[model samples]
Target: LVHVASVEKGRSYEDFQKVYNAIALKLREDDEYDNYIGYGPVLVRLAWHISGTWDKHDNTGGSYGGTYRFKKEFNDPSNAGLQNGFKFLEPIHKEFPWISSGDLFSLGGVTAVQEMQGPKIPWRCGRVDTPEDTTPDNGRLPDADKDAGYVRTFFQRLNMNDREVVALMGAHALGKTHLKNSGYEGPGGAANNVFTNEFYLNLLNEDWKLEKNDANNEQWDSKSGYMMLPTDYSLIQDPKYLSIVKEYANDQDKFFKDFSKAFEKLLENGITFPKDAPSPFIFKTLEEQGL
Candidate 1:
């Protein structure tokens, strides 16, 4: 069950940079999707869902095998809205056919975060596409309706601790939950596209009322037109998670750095990188490149 990281033959940093540019460019061009929330959040969510399938105990699922392209994983009820991210990547894959499904999917996330003004997530390539038979069964992704304790326990399987858990949840700031997709609706904050510490800030500052949505699911909604999943609101309910959440809200730089580290770890889990493997590549955003 050992999944080793193997660089695509003849591929190097420059090659991956091109793929990153392609993903970033597409993100910029596809501005009208999801009510102009754009593809950043969904791409990030796609990367997370694809990697979140890992079971540390057995190493059966994770980003090491790009199994999300297969039917079983793709059709997982939990993955309903991610098809858009896949469609967004179709042209990039066609143009850069050498990149593995795992690498391309994960890189799209890295590109989105950076383009959205999030932290620079150092990315490593080389996740081989596994056969459909290797895809992990459904129900691996976390349920948004759960509580802080459930969130804590669930992330442990992915080997994340309190800090990492809080940091990862910060991503909730980027996207809204559509009722059709997750039985919940509303954006978590005003800047649904930019990556920021707003999730923590909104959780601590907003006056949230627990209510049932049109889909009959419980969520914390604010007068400011923001919402939080039960799992997201749970961050403030628990004392430990609350403290970390407050920290991220108060210190934007700390949140960005921690999130960058935790996210890279989330995407790289279950893949064994060799000592001789290349260092992770940190890509420049379009703004930085003056594109």
Candidate 2:
């Protein structure tokens, strides 16, 4: 059985906490992007998409490699607007020059979720940078226009179950889908920068109208001025996924519990800890620590 381990020699929780503060401070400073939507949500989505590419059996393509820094991966059509997230992190990266890109990127997601009131995701250290050749091939990330079958089959490569898949996409509730980014448009929930079950609630409770966006693609739009990709809408269209959606929509504690587990699993994909790994560290938020 695999086990979690402590940070490598010369690193500790305090060190990582500094990295977290750096990211949190930068997030506060750079409050103007994507029409003031802030970098938090997109950064979380970046970490999710990067890690979401993993295939459990082959042990390939995951956040563990930090491959999104490569040109080929950055140029991916599905990653159009993500350049914003990268640019957002560039300065903190410059200031901290010592932290691994993989760790910084993944930690940005952790910080975003926690600060936004999502969950406490225990993180680990030790993802060393790899050469550009280690970058996964393009087309590994999921497409926004696909159906439920496609979403399920695609996440299977990442070893995600129905509940996990639904919970992760619930993050869609946190950020808007840019037409330029994924050929889809609109925010998935209210308070897009704040984490909540609003994604699931909107999916099940809102009266979504089938409308053509400026891109002329069909999406589910609500009177609340939010939107859902057809694939996101698919979660409720299917009975199994809809059941999980309803559960989360009704229970914040359960949603927080499941989301914490699933998000951490996504960030840790393809990485193996030794037989005596440390328990996951729950970092205090900026507000909590008064930093």
Candidate 3:
């Protein structure tokens, strides 16, 4: 059981603003990941994997402890290509060595979502790195081979409902499932770097074929050169998830609103915030600051 440390008298909001600036500067500089799609998707995935470890019941693991820096956690098969995200953050770490690993990893996710024009995820600062032993066991992340039922059941342990699951999976639209990473391949939309509801639109409008990729792994594909993992396709297959998909697909505003809430919850999982503590702080984008 990892004991929560007293809040470390974290960097002031202004200091974090500078950290945000550093991340934004690098994001602008490194725009070649995933065929020039930028480092956004892998960064989001890293945030998800870190926070996904939270089991609300026992509170044993979560983003509260940034333990992914450990070899055991980093080497998990589920994290195949996430080294890209780690390398993405290395320079930021060098710039702001005062920030905790847990805080930096989670903040990377927040910055990616906002910079991609998704939402202003309210973020707090108090995550402290724990010993390697505190790392959650492997297989905490979702699997792409699974069906809707499996997807629904697995997220329950993470305290996510159907709507939350569907909203989160919409992130798949951002990054392709690398055959080397998840045994699947192909981008999900035309603008993979930017955030949009195109994932739902494609699912509803495209003519998808259940075919295998060069990796010989099965995924639903379209003539537009896009693909969807079985777990992603499951959103439209199941009635409950289908309802949310249609909602997000038809109403971009609704999707943004809901995604902001769910994504913030995902990032904040397992951390204890005092009732008197300030609400999650929303940092301005580098463009907004003219940095």
Model number with the top lDDT? 1
Write down the worst ten-residue block by lDDT for model 1.
282-291
User: Largest TM-score belongs to which candidate?
Assistant: 1
Clashes of each: 0, 3, 0
Tell me the tens digit of each residue's lDDT in model 1 across 176-271.
889998899999899889888989889999999999989898889999999999998999899999999989989999999999999999999999
RMSD of each: 0.7, 2.2, 1.4
Model 3: lDDT to the true structure: 0.85
Regions of model 3 farther than 4 Å from truth: 1-6
Q: Lowest summed lDDT over 10 consecutive residues: which window, candidate 3?
A: 1-10
lDDT of 3 by residue, 113-170 (tens): 8899887888888788888888889878877877999998899988899988888888
- Each prediction's whole-model lDDT (CA): 0.92, 0.82, 0.85
Assess the local accuracy of residue 274 in candidate 2 as a C-alpha lDDT between 0 and 100: 70
